[PDB]
Amino acid sequence: SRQVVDEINYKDYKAVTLPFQHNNSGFTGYLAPTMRQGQPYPANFPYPL
Amino acid sequence: LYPIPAKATNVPISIPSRNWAAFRGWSFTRLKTKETPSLGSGFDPYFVYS
Amino acid sequence: ALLAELEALSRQLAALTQQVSELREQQQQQNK
Amino acid sequence: PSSIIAEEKLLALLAELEALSRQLAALTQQVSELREQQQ
Amino acid sequence: AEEKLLALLAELEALSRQLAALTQQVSELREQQQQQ
Numbered sequence: 001s002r003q004v005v006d007e008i009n010y011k012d013y014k015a016v017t018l019p020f021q022h023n024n025s026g027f028t029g030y031l032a033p034t035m036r037q038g039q040p041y042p043a044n045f046p047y048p049l
Numbered sequence: 050l051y052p053i054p055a056k057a058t059n060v061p062i063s064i065p066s067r068n069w070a071a072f073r074g075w076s077f078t079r080l081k082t083k084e085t086p087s088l089g090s091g092f093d094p095y096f097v098y099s
Numbered sequence: 100a101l102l103a104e105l106e107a108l109s110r111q112l113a114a115l116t117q118q119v120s121e122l123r124e125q126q127q128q129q130n131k
Numbered sequence: 132p133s134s135i136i137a138e139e140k141l142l143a144l145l146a147e148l149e150a151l152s153r154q155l156a157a158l159t160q161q162v163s164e165l166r167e168q169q170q
Numbered sequence: 171a172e173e174k175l176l177a178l179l180a181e182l183e184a185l186s187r188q189l190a191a192l193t194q195q196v197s198e199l200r201e202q203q204q205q206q
Contacts, residue, residue, distance in 0.1 A: 008163045054130040104169055111162050118155045125148045140174045147181045158192050165199060
C-alpha cells in the first residue's frame with residue numbers, strides 16, 4: 001500500500017511536472033547525473049503526508 | 050500461447066469440442082512477445098532480445 | 100443549500116463511472 | 132487503401148477519447164473545489 | 171466508418187453538455203464569493 005496527495009479534493013494541489021520539480025536544488029545536476037547545479041532553496045515537490 | 054495486442058484488456062479463447070478425461074486444471078501467466086522466442090523454427094530471426 | 104449540493108453531486112459523480120466505462124470500451128474498439 | 136481512413140477515424144476517436152479524459156479531469160476537480168468552497 | 175461517426179457525434183455532444191455543466195457551475199462560486 002501507499003498514500004499519495006489527493007489531486008481532486010485538495011484546494012491547493014498543483015501539478016508540477018518533472019523539469020519544474022525541485023528538491024536538493026544547488027546540490028544536484030539538473031535532470032542528469034552531471035555535476036551539481038543551481039542554488040539552495042525551499043523544496044517544492046513532494047507534499048508532506 | 051495466445052497473443053494480446055498492445056493496450057488490449059480482454060483475451061477471449063475457446064476450444065471447439067474436446068474430451069476432458071484426466072484433465073488436471075489450468076495454470077497460466079503473461080509473457081512479453083519480445084522476451085520469448087518462437088520454436089519449431091530451427092532459428093528465430095526476430096528474437097532480438099537476450 | 101447543502102442538501103441540493105449533495106443532490107447535484109449524486110448526478111455529477113454518477114458521470115465518473117460512466118466516463119470510465121466509456122474510456123474502457125473505447126480502448127476495446129482499437130484492435131483486432 | 133482503407134487503412135489510411137480507418138487509421139484517420141481511429142485517430143479521430145482516440146483524439147475525442149483523450150478529449151473526454153482530459154476534460155472530465157477538469158469537471159471532477161471543479162465540482163470538488165465547489166463542494167470544498169461550500170464546505 | 172459509419173458507426174465511428176455515430177460515436178464521435180455522441181462524444182462531441184457529451185463534451186458540449188459537460189462543458190455546459192462546468193461553465194454554468196463556476197458561476198455559483200462567482201455568486202458565493204460576491205456574497206462573502
